[PDB]
PDB file of C-alpha atoms in Angstrom:
ATOM      1  CA  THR A   4      -3.135  11.223  13.477  1.00  0.00           C
ATOM      2  CA  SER A   5      -3.978   8.317  11.048  1.00  0.00           C
ATOM      3  CA  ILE A   6      -1.233   6.219   9.518  1.00  0.00           C
ATOM      4  CA  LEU A   7      -1.853   7.732   6.110  1.00  0.00           C
ATOM      5  CA  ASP A   8      -1.178  11.217   7.517  1.00  0.00           C
ATOM      6  CA  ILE A   9       2.411  10.644   8.803  1.00  0.00           C
ATOM      7  CA  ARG A  10       4.655  12.438   6.292  1.00  0.00           C
ATOM      8  CA  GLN A  11       8.326  12.847   7.104  1.00  0.00           C
ATOM      9  CA  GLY A  12       9.435  16.492   7.119  1.00  0.00           C
ATOM     10  CA  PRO A  13      12.460  17.675   5.089  1.00  0.00           C
ATOM     11  CA  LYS A  14      14.341  18.705   8.276  1.00  0.00           C
ATOM     12  CA  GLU A  15      13.241  15.546  10.147  1.00  0.00           C
ATOM     13  CA  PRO A  16      15.765  12.850  10.893  1.00  0.00           C
ATOM     14  CA  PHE A  17      14.639   9.545   9.332  1.00  0.00           C
ATOM     15  CA  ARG A  18      14.753   7.640  12.604  1.00  0.00           C
ATOM     16  CA  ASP A  19      12.407  10.201  14.130  1.00  0.00           C
ATOM     17  CA  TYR A  20       9.988   9.813  11.220  1.00  0.00           C
ATOM     18  CA  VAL A  21      10.149   6.018  11.561  1.00  0.00           C
ATOM     19  CA  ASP A  22       9.328   6.268  15.329  1.00  0.00           C
ATOM     20  CA  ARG A  23       6.326   8.599  14.579  1.00  0.00           C
ATOM     21  CA  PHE A  24       5.179   6.247  11.807  1.00  0.00           C
ATOM     22  CA  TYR A  25       5.268   3.251  14.132  1.00  0.00           C
ATOM     23  CA  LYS A  26       3.675   4.795  17.233  1.00  0.00           C
ATOM     24  CA  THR A  27       0.751   5.788  14.909  1.00  0.00           C
ATOM     25  CA  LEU A  28       0.751   2.446  13.137  1.00  0.00           C
ATOM     26  CA  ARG A  29       0.443   0.664  16.476  1.00  0.00           C
ATOM     27  CA  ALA A  30      -2.433   2.886  17.591  1.00  0.00           C
ATOM     28  CA  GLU A  31      -4.213   2.139  14.273  1.00  0.00           C
ATOM     29  CA  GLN A  32      -6.503  -0.844  14.429  1.00  0.00           C
ATOM     30  CA  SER A  33      -5.081  -3.793  12.471  1.00  0.00           C
ATOM     31  CA  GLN A  34      -8.288  -4.397  10.476  1.00  0.00           C
ATOM     32  CA  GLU A  35      -8.560  -0.781   9.236  1.00  0.00           C
ATOM     33  CA  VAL A  36      -5.015  -0.550   7.885  1.00  0.00           C
ATOM     34  CA  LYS A  37      -5.319  -3.997   6.255  1.00  0.00           C
ATOM     35  CA  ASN A  38      -8.384  -3.073   4.134  1.00  0.00           C
ATOM     36  CA  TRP A  39      -7.009   0.284   3.295  1.00  0.00           C
ATOM     37  CA  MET A  40      -3.797  -1.611   2.260  1.00  0.00           C
ATOM     38  CA  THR A  41      -5.455  -4.181   0.098  1.00  0.00           C
ATOM     39  CA  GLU A  42      -7.951  -1.853  -1.628  1.00  0.00           C
ATOM     40  CA  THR A  43      -5.188   0.548  -2.393  1.00  0.00           C
ATOM     41  CA  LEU A  44      -3.282  -2.310  -4.092  1.00  0.00           C
ATOM     42  CA  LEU A  45      -6.399  -3.525  -5.883  1.00  0.00           C
ATOM     43  CA  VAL A  46      -7.100  -0.092  -7.290  1.00  0.00           C
ATOM     44  CA  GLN A  47      -3.458   0.574  -8.146  1.00  0.00           C
ATOM     45  CA  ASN A  48      -3.307  -2.679 -10.103  1.00  0.00           C
ATOM     46  CA  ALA A  49      -6.591  -2.293 -12.050  1.00  0.00           C
ATOM     47  CA  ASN A  50      -6.404  -1.461 -15.797  1.00  0.00           C
ATOM     48  CA  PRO A  51      -6.270   2.224 -16.865  1.00  0.00           C
ATOM     49  CA  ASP A  52      -9.988   2.327 -17.864  1.00  0.00           C
ATOM     50  CA  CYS A  53     -11.409   0.864 -14.577  1.00  0.00           C
ATOM     51  CA  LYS A  54      -8.869   2.629 -12.355  1.00  0.00           C
ATOM     52  CA  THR A  55     -10.467   5.923 -13.494  1.00  0.00           C
ATOM     53  CA  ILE A  56     -13.954   5.133 -12.296  1.00  0.00           C
ATOM     54  CA  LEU A  57     -12.497   3.679  -9.131  1.00  0.00           C
ATOM     55  CA  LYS A  58     -10.689   6.853  -8.136  1.00  0.00           C
ATOM     56  CA  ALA A  59     -13.705   8.921  -9.323  1.00  0.00           C
ATOM     57  CA  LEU A  60     -15.655   7.166  -6.556  1.00  0.00           C
ATOM     58  CA  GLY A  61     -13.781   9.046  -3.821  1.00  0.00           C
ATOM     59  CA  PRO A  62     -12.329   7.580  -0.574  1.00  0.00           C
ATOM     60  CA  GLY A  63     -13.956   4.704   1.251  1.00  0.00           C
ATOM     61  CA  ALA A  64     -15.896   2.919  -1.448  1.00  0.00           C
ATOM     62  CA  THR A  65     -16.964  -0.599  -0.772  1.00  0.00           C
ATOM     63  CA  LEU A  66     -15.886  -3.527  -2.941  1.00  0.00           C
ATOM     64  CA  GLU A  67     -19.556  -3.951  -3.957  1.00  0.00           C
ATOM     65  CA  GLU A  68     -19.556  -0.272  -4.958  1.00  0.00           C
ATOM     66  CA  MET A  69     -16.247  -0.685  -6.813  1.00  0.00           C
ATOM     67  CA  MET A  70     -17.547  -3.585  -8.863  1.00  0.00           C
ATOM     68  CA  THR A  71     -20.962  -1.974  -9.350  1.00  0.00           C
ATOM     69  CA  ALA A  72     -19.267   1.061 -10.814  1.00  0.00           C
ATOM     70  CA  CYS A  73     -17.057  -0.969 -13.233  1.00  0.00           C
ATOM     71  CA  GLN A  74     -19.826  -3.032 -14.929  1.00  0.00           C
ATOM     72  CA  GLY A  75     -19.359  -3.655 -18.666  1.00  0.00           C
ATOM     73  CA  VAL A  76     -15.631  -2.790 -18.932  1.00  0.00           C
TER      74      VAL A  76
ATOM     75  CA  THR B   4       1.544 -15.653  -8.367  1.00  0.00           C
ATOM     76  CA  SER B   5       2.269 -13.078  -5.556  1.00  0.00           C
ATOM     77  CA  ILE B   6      -0.286 -10.449  -4.638  1.00  0.00           C
ATOM     78  CA  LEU B   7       1.859  -7.716  -6.127  1.00  0.00           C
ATOM     79  CA  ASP B   8       1.798  -9.490  -9.509  1.00  0.00           C
ATOM     80  CA  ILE B   9      -2.015  -9.541 -10.075  1.00  0.00           C
ATOM     81  CA  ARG B  10      -2.654  -6.866 -12.719  1.00  0.00           C
ATOM     82  CA  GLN B  11      -6.095  -6.632 -14.273  1.00  0.00           C
ATOM     83  CA  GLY B  12      -6.028  -7.003 -18.064  1.00  0.00           C
ATOM     84  CA  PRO B  13      -7.707  -4.436 -20.359  1.00  0.00           C
ATOM     85  CA  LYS B  14     -10.163  -7.069 -21.697  1.00  0.00           C
ATOM     86  CA  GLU B  15     -10.730  -8.555 -18.210  1.00  0.00           C
ATOM     87  CA  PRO B  16     -14.029  -8.015 -16.470  1.00  0.00           C
ATOM     88  CA  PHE B  17     -13.460  -6.262 -13.119  1.00  0.00           C
ATOM     89  CA  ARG B  18     -15.220  -8.942 -11.103  1.00  0.00           C
ATOM     90  CA  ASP B  19     -12.886 -11.536 -12.589  1.00  0.00           C
ATOM     91  CA  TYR B  20      -9.854  -9.441 -11.649  1.00  0.00           C
ATOM     92  CA  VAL B  21     -11.221  -9.005  -8.115  1.00  0.00           C
ATOM     93  CA  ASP B  22     -11.683 -12.826  -7.765  1.00  0.00           C
ATOM     94  CA  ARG B  23      -8.062 -13.434  -9.002  1.00  0.00           C
ATOM     95  CA  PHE B  24      -6.789 -10.729  -6.637  1.00  0.00           C
ATOM     96  CA  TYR B  25      -8.526 -12.325  -3.666  1.00  0.00           C
ATOM     97  CA  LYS B  26      -7.693 -15.987  -4.323  1.00  0.00           C
ATOM     98  CA  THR B  27      -4.004 -14.847  -4.461  1.00  0.00           C
ATOM     99  CA  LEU B  28      -4.383 -12.560  -1.470  1.00  0.00           C
ATOM    100  CA  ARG B  29      -5.751 -15.449   0.578  1.00  0.00           C
ATOM    101  CA  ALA B  30      -2.904 -17.750  -0.446  1.00  0.00           C
ATOM    102  CA  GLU B  31      -0.411 -15.018   0.582  1.00  0.00           C
ATOM    103  CA  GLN B  32       0.715 -15.275   4.164  1.00  0.00           C
ATOM    104  CA  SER B  33      -0.760 -12.473   6.291  1.00  0.00           C
ATOM    105  CA  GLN B  34       2.607 -11.425   7.774  1.00  0.00           C
ATOM    106  CA  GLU B  35       4.324 -11.017   4.372  1.00  0.00           C
ATOM    107  CA  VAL B  36       1.674  -8.758   2.851  1.00  0.00           C
ATOM    108  CA  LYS B  37       1.488  -6.674   6.053  1.00  0.00           C
ATOM    109  CA  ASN B  38       5.215  -5.751   6.044  1.00  0.00           C
ATOM    110  CA  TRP B  39       5.247  -5.190   2.365  1.00  0.00           C
ATOM    111  CA  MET B  40       2.167  -2.928   2.975  1.00  0.00           C
ATOM    112  CA  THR B  41       3.629  -0.904   5.768  1.00  0.00           C
ATOM    113  CA  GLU B  42       7.125  -0.448   4.283  1.00  0.00           C
ATOM    114  CA  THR B  43       5.611   0.627   1.037  1.00  0.00           C
ATOM    115  CA  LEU B  44       3.642   3.312   2.937  1.00  0.00           C
ATOM    116  CA  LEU B  45       6.680   4.308   4.979  1.00  0.00           C
ATOM    117  CA  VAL B  46       8.784   4.782   1.880  1.00  0.00           C
ATOM    118  CA  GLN B  47       6.006   6.524  -0.042  1.00  0.00           C
ATOM    119  CA  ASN B  48       5.581   9.011   2.799  1.00  0.00           C
ATOM    120  CA  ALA B  49       9.289   9.807   3.383  1.00  0.00           C
ATOM    121  CA  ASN B  50      10.627  13.221   2.233  1.00  0.00           C
ATOM    122  CA  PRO B  51      11.942  13.573  -1.356  1.00  0.00           C
ATOM    123  CA  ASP B  52      15.637  13.405  -0.283  1.00  0.00           C
ATOM    124  CA  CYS B  53      15.375  10.181   1.837  1.00  0.00           C
ATOM    125  CA  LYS B  54      12.868   8.508  -0.491  1.00  0.00           C
ATOM    126  CA  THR B  55      15.644   8.495  -3.136  1.00  0.00           C
ATOM    127  CA  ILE B  56      18.132   6.500  -1.123  1.00  0.00           C
ATOM    128  CA  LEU B  57      15.336   4.229   0.010  1.00  0.00           C
ATOM    129  CA  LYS B  58      14.310   3.231  -3.495  1.00  0.00           C
ATOM    130  CA  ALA B  59      18.013   3.077  -4.516  1.00  0.00           C
ATOM    131  CA  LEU B  60      18.314   0.240  -1.986  1.00  0.00           C
ATOM    132  CA  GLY B  61      16.264  -2.130  -4.157  1.00  0.00           C
ATOM    133  CA  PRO B  62      13.442  -4.478  -3.005  1.00  0.00           C
ATOM    134  CA  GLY B  63      13.445  -6.127   0.391  1.00  0.00           C
ATOM    135  CA  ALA B  64      15.570  -3.829   2.498  1.00  0.00           C
ATOM    136  CA  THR B  65      15.271  -4.118   6.212  1.00  0.00           C
ATOM    137  CA  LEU B  66      14.181  -1.221   8.418  1.00  0.00           C
ATOM    138  CA  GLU B  67      17.685  -1.261   9.968  1.00  0.00           C
ATOM    139  CA  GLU B  68      19.096  -1.009   6.436  1.00  0.00           C
ATOM    140  CA  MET B  69      16.638   1.775   5.557  1.00  0.00           C
ATOM    141  CA  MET B  70      17.645   3.859   8.547  1.00  0.00           C
ATOM    142  CA  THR B  71      21.337   3.018   8.146  1.00  0.00           C
ATOM    143  CA  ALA B  72      21.199   4.319   4.608  1.00  0.00           C
ATOM    144  CA  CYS B  73      19.443   7.613   5.569  1.00  0.00           C
ATOM    145  CA  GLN B  74      21.890   8.781   8.298  1.00  0.00           C
ATOM    146  CA  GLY B  75      22.549  12.539   8.419  1.00  0.00           C
ATOM    147  CA  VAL B  76      19.554  13.715   6.331  1.00  0.00           C
TER     148      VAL B  76
END
């Protein structure tokens, strides 16, 4: 599993979810999670007009691509 | 400013927002943003019942506190 895949169940004790979360998080490579982190925040904090184009780019877009797509707004 | 405070305006060119974002991000301490990152994901991915208590704890709760509060679900 990837870190973004770990959902807690609704019959799963919270400590058991937290342990799953963290085993996965540790097996994730620090640099991957970091960029996913920071891009997620960057998109989430962009104005409503840009934010649209940004999500309409699908997963994994580069910063260059993000900025290319938002020209003129 | 903190990283979580950088909102893009609706008259702000996207490249200018991205530059603000990143100057702030760089001035943030790596360890702070990381924990904020990972707790945010952990909360966001918790079941609807737990997730409630977790947000009802307010900003900055410890993992210990998070798990303490979710006992029995």
